[PDB]
Symmetry: C2
Subunit: 74 residues, 2 copies
């Protein structure tokens, strides 16, 4: 009767609240994927930055070795 | 002569400074690897946390569907 009417809209009111929360976690589940692919790019960028500074220093020792070799050849 | 003595210790003083900086970048290059493997674990942990909350909600809808089905069977 009228008791089953209220026992239907309430039984769906909880479902509608779970379906909404179930969907937000799904959206946050792809949001942490985007935030993780971002840090993978920042990591790969910061790595290449340091990897070329060591190449920018490997050539400074060579330049100093050529300055030393150019003098010892006299 | 004495000019080449100072032109030797100075030529090595710059090298010793580059070799020190070249090594720090190498140590920081593995430090960003450890800091990146850490966030990969935090990401994989936070993912599994959300992935089971949606399984903790998928069973709440089933429990409510069984409560609804148990009444309609009367």
């Amino acid at each position: 009767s009228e008791l089953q009417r209220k026992e239907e809209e309430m039984r769906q009111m909880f479902v509608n609240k779970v379906k909404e929360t179930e969907l937000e976690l799904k959206e946050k589940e792809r949001e942490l994927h985007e935030k993780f692919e971002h840090l993978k790019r920042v990591h790969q960028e910061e790595k290449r930055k340091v990897e070329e500074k060591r190449r920018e220093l490997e050539e400074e020792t060579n330049a100093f070795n050529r300055r030393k070799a150019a003098v010892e050849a006299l």
